[PDB]
Ligand binder design. Structure first.
Ligand code: FMN
Ligand code: FMN
Lengths: 255, 257
């Protein structure tokens, strides 16, 4: 009864325009509510006007040239172009323009879809470059850490407070009876701690979450039956998943 | 006979996936799907006509969303909802769906119209990419904290040098090894100014040769601003790349000899 297509265009989320090439300067003869919502204009502010008003300073002339060419050829076009809201706000317009021809092939109208793709072409790209920057920074900060621990030969370890998972420097591993590449946990260290010392170590390891620095003097018996006297100085980095940092030294020789 | 409908073509040529149903037919079936809809879903026209749009729902579809749609349709009210839908392939996508009733002049319901906008980038890729950026942001801060801790706890005389600029950072120990202020600005020249004349050239040649990335060692004397002769032993290595950073560890070996 009331054209389903007229209503489909009226109620769609897709900003849409219909122009009349037979009228001077191919003006807008229809803009749907979604278009007026995207741009901030009122119907009266866009009718009888060529769609050019969407272009501004940041608009690439090569893009305008491509559109001009396609319209003159009476050929469809898909282009991503910088356009401007009534506010002055720039946005990426994933534009589509299609000619409307009758059965004879007589050009009668032009139709368009204007999809704001700013998230894809601007936010997603800038967030992707922001993480590559942060990815290099982390690798550089790690390289600095690995250098100091190897050159200054520091027995440095990190421990995820809740998980228990550990990382161990080459020196930290040689202090205990560890393999250069074997995975370490607080349990791999506890397995070596002398029975008489086990409770104090579990006790100070739990009070790490406070963030205040501490010291732990304990003995170990290595997997090769060697009794070593250790002195550890630790501090937990507070936050979401606290990371306890510690430097271990083998104080056995002052005996 | 000659005037083709601009609206029929607008729907045909739009980038927006669109559906038209007939509530007067059993189960409110699809009576029209535009090429953009068939392109998004991977279906063929014949595979979607005469069918309720429900076939887009799957396991991950929230039943609360389906009830909101069922309710709005029954009320003959428009609806905007973000719902998990599925492509012919089985591929899950975020559908920013819109459904609107179509009423005639006497206000009689005649059709339902829709727009199905794939918003997966916004509700899924953007969210996961931010959660990923936060993670690295904390990691960077934690990696710095680890470095600052080692240099303070282990008493390390550690410095960094921007290869081209000469912009140097010194640790509190590095600063006490030379005759430096705890917060004064340090450059390779601030160090060179203290190096004994007899040693200056060996230091400058090795500093320029650092960019190779190959580690090196230097043993040189300094005379502090306080007139003290100190024997130093430095071990350095430049981190290669688009901006080389020279890392070095200085030790005061005067004590030894
Ligand atoms: C149906 C239709 C929709 C259009 N929509 C837009 C649009 O959203 N953004 C835009 O920058 N240009 C749009 N244009 C293009 C301009 O109206 C115009 O054709 C272009 O600026 C090239 O012509 P010119 O060099 O004479 O300005 C549209 C054109 C038509 C026919
Ligand atoms: C015009 C129109 C378009 C619809 N498009 C979708 C769609 O893209 N995705 C979807 O999950 N459901 C869509 N629906 C909703 C379902 O067809 C159905 O109404 C819903 O699953 C609730 O009814 P039910 O509980 O009987 O299944 C659409 C409904 C109408 C009327």
């Amino acid at each position: 009864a009331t054209d389903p297509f007229r209503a489909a265009v009226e109620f769609t989320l897709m900003p849409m325009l219909i122009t009349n090439p037979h009228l001077p300067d191919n003006p807008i003869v229809f803009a749907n509510p979604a278009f007026l919502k995207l741009t901030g204009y009122e119907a009266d502010e866009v009718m009888g006007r060529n769609c050019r008003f969407l272009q501004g300073h940041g608009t690439d002339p090569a893009h305008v040239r491509a559109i001009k060419s396609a319209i003159a050829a009476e050929k469809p076009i898909d282009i991503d172009i910088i356009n401007y809201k009534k506010s002055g706000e720039a946005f990426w317009n994933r534009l589509h323009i299609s000619p409307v021809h009758n059965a004879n092939g007589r050009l009668q109208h032009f139709v368009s879809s204007q999809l704001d793709v700013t998230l894809e072409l601007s936010r997603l790209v800038e967030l992707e470059k922001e993480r590559k920057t942060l990815s290099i920074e982390t690798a550089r900060s790690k390289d600095q850490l690995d250098y100091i621990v190897e050159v200054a030969n520091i027995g440095f370890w990190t421990r995820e407070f809740y998980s228990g998972k550990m990382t161990c420097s080459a020196e930290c591993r040689r202090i205990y009876g560890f393999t250069p590449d074997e995975p370490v946990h607080f349990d791999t260290i506890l397995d070596l701690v002398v029975l008489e010392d086990r409770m104090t170590v579990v006790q100070k390891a739990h009070q790490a979450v406070t963030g205040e620095p501490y010291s732990i003097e304990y003995r170990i018996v290595t997997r090769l039956g060697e009794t070593r006297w250790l002195e550890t100085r630790a501090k937990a980095l507070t936050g979401e998943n606290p990371l306890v940092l510690g430097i271990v030294q083998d104080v056995t020789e002052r005996k």
